[PDB]
Write an enzyme that holds these catalytic residues in place. Structure first.
Site: not given
Ligand SMILES: O=c1[nH]c2cc(O)ccc2n1-c1nc2ccccc2[nH]1
Length: 257
Positions: A85, A130, A135
């Site tokens: 997602e 965690d 997270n």
């Molecule tokens: O949309 C995201 N899905 C993610 C899953 C993860 O394990 C780590 C980061 C995720 N992430 C995400 N959306 C962001 C939008 C702006 C900056 C960092 C982001 N990380």
């Protein structure tokens, strides 16, 4: 039934430990999502193939609007890609960086949203273990979405960041769904104050501080919040509340929604 070919890779969203998470769009559908690219050379040399299998088996089965969805996985020779997602507004970490503290209405909201996610998790007998701002992610409407189930399991356990770890985990002892309640207190405190309640400069001071539940509140922390944090950060896990007690805590209910 997926390959890299089915995706156009946008910008890198986050630089993790075993790889990165990229924005990406599926081609037949024009579906926007996140693609987390781990590759095996590092995973096996770290010996965590089954930690990843649990992360997947768990995160797939779970559906809740405050939990990040994992639509599926695939792999090739080198890499393993997790189809995730996409959460537009990034992490609570980055949000807390911008705004040195959250107010009580933002903080309490995030907690109700987090509690729901957890009470659903603990209903399926799953533990996150965690929880931290890194997270937690934020949906398009600012909503809180737990992600990164890398250290999830079912039912009791031992094994065993460290600011969010409870005494039972760091000291070595076995533990249960109660760890997520201790972490929730750490997290509530951090939201209001701008740093975790046991933060230290060295590992060994943090171990001792956590072990002895050695934290003080600033003057500006209200008693309603002090209460909930003090109840959640009890060394004896049995003592820590039920999730619903947290959801129906007066300070929470005053400030949520
Ligand atoms: O949309 C995201 N899905 C993610 C899953 C993860 O394990 C780590 C980061 C995720 N992430 C995400 N959306 C962001 C939008 C702006 C900056 C960092 C982001 N990380």
């Amino acid at each position: 039934q997926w390959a890299l070919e089915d995706f156009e890779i946008g910008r890198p969203l986050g630089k993790g430990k075993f790889g990165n998470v990229y924005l990406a769009r599926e081609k037949q559908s024009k579906f926007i999502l996140a693609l987390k690219v781990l590759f095996k050379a590092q995973l096996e040399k770290a010996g965590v193939e089954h930690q990843l299998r649990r992360e997947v088996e768990i995160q797939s089965h779970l559906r809740h609007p405050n939990i990040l969805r994992l639509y599926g996985y695939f792999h090739d020779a080198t890499r393993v890609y997790l189809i995730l997602e996409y959460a537009p507004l990034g992490t609570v970490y980055r949000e807390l960086q911008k705004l040195s503290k959250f107010d009580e209405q933002r903080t309490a909201t995030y907690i109700t949203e987090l509690a729901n996610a957890l009470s659903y998790c603990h209903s399926k007998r799953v533990i996150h273990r965690d929880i931290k701002p890194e997270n937690l992610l934020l949906g398009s409407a600012g909503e809180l979405k737990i992600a990164d189930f890398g250290w999830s399991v079912h039912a009791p356990s031992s094994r065993r960041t460290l600011d969010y770890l409870p005494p039972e985990m760091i000291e070595g002892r076995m533990h249960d769904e109660k760890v997520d309640l201790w972490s929730l207190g750490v997290l509530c405190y951090e939201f209001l104050v701008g740093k975790p309640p046991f933060e230290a400069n060295t590992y060994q001071e943090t171990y001792k501080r956590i072990s002895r539940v050695e934290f003080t509140f600033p003057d500006f922390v209200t008693e309603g919040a002090r209460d909930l944090i003090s109840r959640l950060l009890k060394h004896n896990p049995s003592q820590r509340p039920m999730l619903r007690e947290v959801l129906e805590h007066p300070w929470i209910t005053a400030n949520s929604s």
